[PDB]
Design an enzyme around this catalytic site. Sequence first.
Site, PDB file in Angstrom:
ATOM      1  N   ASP A   1     -11.852  -0.975   6.432  1.00 22.65           N
ATOM      2  CA  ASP A   1     -11.228  -1.343   5.163  1.00 22.65           C
ATOM      3  C   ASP A   1     -10.115  -2.366   5.384  1.00 22.65           C
ATOM      4  O   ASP A   1      -9.017  -2.252   4.838  1.00 22.65           O
ATOM      5  CB  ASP A   1     -10.700  -0.104   4.441  1.00 22.65           C
ATOM      6  CG  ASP A   1     -10.538  -0.323   2.948  1.00 22.65           C
ATOM      7  OD1 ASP A   1     -11.210  -1.220   2.396  1.00 22.65           O
ATOM      8  OD2 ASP A   1      -9.732   0.400   2.325  1.00 22.65           O
TER       9      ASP A   1
ATOM     10  N   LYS B   1       9.362   1.625   4.051  1.00 24.68           N
ATOM     11  CA  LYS B   1       8.405   2.104   3.064  1.00 24.68           C
ATOM     12  C   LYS B   1       8.674   3.573   2.773  1.00 24.68           C
ATOM     13  O   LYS B   1       8.877   4.368   3.699  1.00 24.68           O
ATOM     14  CB  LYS B   1       6.970   1.913   3.557  1.00 24.68           C
ATOM     15  CG  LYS B   1       5.931   2.711   2.783  1.00 24.68           C
ATOM     16  CD  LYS B   1       4.614   1.958   2.694  1.00 24.68           C
ATOM     17  CE  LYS B   1       3.436   2.891   2.897  1.00 24.68           C
ATOM     18  NZ  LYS B   1       2.222   2.164   3.354  1.00 24.68           N
TER      19      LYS B   1
ATOM     20  N   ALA C   1       0.793  -1.229   0.000  1.00 26.43           N
ATOM     21  CA  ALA C   1       0.000   0.000   0.000  1.00 26.43           C
ATOM     22  C   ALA C   1       0.827   1.283   0.000  1.00 26.43           C
ATOM     23  O   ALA C   1       1.903   1.350   0.604  1.00 26.43           O
ATOM     24  CB  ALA C   1      -0.957   0.011   1.196  1.00 26.43           C
ATOM     25  N   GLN C   2       0.321   2.303  -0.694  1.00 27.06           N
ATOM     26  CA  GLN C   2       0.786   3.688  -0.603  1.00 27.06           C
ATOM     27  C   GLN C   2       2.246   3.875  -1.015  1.00 27.06           C
ATOM     28  O   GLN C   2       2.872   4.873  -0.639  1.00 27.06           O
ATOM     29  CB  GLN C   2       0.570   4.251   0.807  1.00 27.06           C
ATOM     30  CG  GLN C   2      -0.781   4.923   1.007  1.00 27.06           C
ATOM     31  CD  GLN C   2      -0.723   6.077   1.990  1.00 27.06           C
ATOM     32  OE1 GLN C   2      -0.397   5.894   3.163  1.00 27.06           O
ATOM     33  NE2 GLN C   2      -1.040   7.275   1.513  1.00 27.06           N
ATOM     34  N   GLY C   3       2.815   2.962  -1.780  1.00 32.81           N
ATOM     35  CA  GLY C   3       4.152   3.208  -2.286  1.00 32.81           C
ATOM     36  C   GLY C   3       4.939   1.914  -2.421  1.00 32.81           C
ATOM     37  O   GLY C   3       4.372   0.849  -2.658  1.00 32.81           O
TER      38      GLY C   3
END
Length: 346
Positions: free
Chosen positions: A145, A49, A30-32
């Site tokens: 989620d 990350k 996720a996100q990168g």
Amino acid sequence: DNQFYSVEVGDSTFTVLKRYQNLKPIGSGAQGIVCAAYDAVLDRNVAIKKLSRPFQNQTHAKRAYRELVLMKCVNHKNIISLLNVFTPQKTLEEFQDVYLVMELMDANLCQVIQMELDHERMSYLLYQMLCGIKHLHSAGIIHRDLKPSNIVVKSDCTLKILDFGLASFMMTPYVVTRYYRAPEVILGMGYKENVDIWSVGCIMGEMVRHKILFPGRDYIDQWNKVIEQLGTPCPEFMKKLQPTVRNYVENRPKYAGLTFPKLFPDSLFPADSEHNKLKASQARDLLSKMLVIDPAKRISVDDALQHPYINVWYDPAEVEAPPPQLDEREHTIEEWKELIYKEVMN
Ligand SMILES: COc1ccccc1Nc1cc2cnn(-c3cc(C(=O)NC4COC4)sc3C)c2cc1F
């Protein structure tokens, strides 16, 4: 002379502190883009990350600030803990990237789902998932989620959640997964704590079936698969719907709904011994209390933690860590940069 150095992982550039060595790519997460590395100061392996310009838009920024704040806000062995947060840039003016460092795990929950698991390890993963969710709820954080791709596992069964969940318009060719969201989310209903129980049921059912329970191009197809298998909810459930969604759902073709023996036949569970025979019916029983459309008829986190399939892992101090400043509104790029930069530097 500086404490940083640059490497190329994929087509991405990682400028990280000199304590992290031997960077190699691992998964999506996720996100990168995420890296595995050795930490020479701690003498252990870590995951790093990179958040590339998280302030570039509201969606990226609101989430990034929310993550960075909330991580020094939880303390539980099944929720992400950061070993380090840093940026190689020196000032707010040149500020560009944020790097998050965490313990190196071994695999996604997606990979574990593809495997054929025993009841002992199956229920222990769900136990750890329920504990982490309970902790978040007790901290006033309702995820909404949960998905397998955001839950990491170690070879010894240990499990951690990564992302803290929802709080829109994206520009990239990266698409969000929606198959694990609860009917409350699909239908904009207003929710409570057990909105995350639906996601756990979707995961558990996929571990049994090795197929996404409710796939679809969007909420239209996804809703059809929910009612196709579970049936049209009772008139009480739909009374709680907003008039517009009400009309669309009332007018959807009525479905009787299959029972859970036929949804998850005994063929999908081990049942060659008496212990496995009993655990199969327990596993199917919990599934039937989690995969409930009406949240009023859905089992709660605490009740599921006391389910015979789950409670075999209960221990006195295992979720006994009470929470040891708030969300914002509309900010600009300049303001999100400063807000994020402050949280990084403290
Ligand atoms: C909010 O998320 C994050 C926040 C901060 C930092 C990272 C992240 N994300 C993130 C964290 C982990 C922790 N372990 N893994 C992982 C390792 C794999 C692997 O192949 N390990 C080899 C076998 O031992 C070497 S597979 C896999 C899913 C991760 C992947 C991640 F994306």
